[PDB]
Design a protein around this ligand. Structure first.
Ligand SMILES: *[C@@H]1O[C@H](CO)[C@@H](O)[C@H](O)[C@H]1NC(C)=O
Ligand SMILES: *[C@@H]1O[C@H](CO)[C@@H](O)[C@H](O)[C@H]1NC(C)=O
Lengths: 49, 49
């Protein structure tokens, strides 16, 4: 629900984020603060292209 | 998790695969061997087009 569209569930119990994500980028997701819109445009591209 | 993007959950308890899938294609999914990348490009097209 948090990651939203930015990533996909590989199935192996991991989410294959579709965009460059630095350590800070990761940390922002673990607390729950992370926002999808930020990387939305970026991720969306690597997915369907 | 297996089908990944290739298909969609119709809701009626079925997955509407978006690409030509022969009997072998199906069998590969039942054991779990099946790979998404193979039909990724193909399926992706029929979905958003
Ligand atoms: C979540 O991570 C961000 C990093 O951008 C940090 O500023 C914040 O303190 C963290 N929040 C929690 C609950 O740890
Ligand atoms: C899965 O299906 C493939 C068909 O390509 C077949 O080669 C393989 O033996 C099957 N594996 C299992 C576990 O039945």
């Amino acid at each position: 629900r948090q990651l939203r569209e930015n990533a996909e569930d590989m199935g192996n119990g991991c989410f294959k984020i579709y965009h460059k994500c630095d350590n800070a980028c990761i940390e922002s997701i673990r607390n729950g603060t992370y926002d999808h819109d930020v990387y939305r445009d970026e991720a969306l591209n690597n997915r369907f292209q």
